[PDB]
Amino acid sequence: FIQMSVQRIVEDAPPIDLQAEAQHASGEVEEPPRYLLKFEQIYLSKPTHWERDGAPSPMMPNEARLRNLTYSAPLYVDITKTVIKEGEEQLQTQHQKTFIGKIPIMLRSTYCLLNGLTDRDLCELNECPLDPGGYFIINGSEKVLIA
């Protein structure tokens, strides 16, 4: 779902364009400002929390349960804004890197930071090595999907 489907959906088919109703009641000389937006590469951090200070930090899935947070990670995307006005200029395009939302992480999958660690490290993080994972954590509760 993360490695293919999410990237596929934002790359797929929603390019959009917009154009004000210029030359209203009068006008002529030119061609009604227009703007095009398209979304590309997508990025997904390791799960993060933000203290009231605003300081971002590595979250640990146990901390998420005792404080009732939500074990999720922030999502970012490449966005472009693209002008080929009706004449005077076709280039003036700008690259951005933008935060769009927070996606819940299923525990010990390739994006849940616990996967890269061994038995001793998980035991040191106070998260049991023999837990199976594969379940979301939302608002302090472990939430599992039924097939």
Partner: protein, 98 residues
């Protein structure tokens, strides 16, 4: 069998088309006025984040506007009574009926 992949994928697309509407409607409002555009301001991060967070938490389906009864109880609190219990719930399979 619909697993997390096809369910979230339907769900995320639901969230993304809606976000797409909020950028369009915002940019349309800007152009009506004109010359004062920004792009991070048009996007509502809450739309994606909360729309999925809501679905997983409650158990409901869709963004609530397009019903919810067709995929009731697809999400659950993981039972953990005994290690075999947890392991069994992660291996649960369900089958829709009247």
């Amino acid at each position: 069998l619909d697993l997390a992949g096809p369910l979230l994928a339907f769900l995320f697309r639901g969230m993304f088309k809606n976000l797409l509407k909020e950028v369009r409607i915002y940019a349309q409002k800007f152009i009506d006025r004109g010359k004062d555009f920004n792009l991070e301001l048009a996007i509502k991060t809450r739309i994606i984040s909360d729309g999925l967070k809501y679905s997983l938490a409650t158990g409901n389906w869709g963004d609530q506007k397009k019903a919810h009864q067709a995929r009731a109880g697809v999400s659950q609190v993981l039972n953990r009574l005994t290690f075999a219990s947890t392991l069994s719930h992660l291996r649960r399979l369900n089958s829709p009926i009247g």
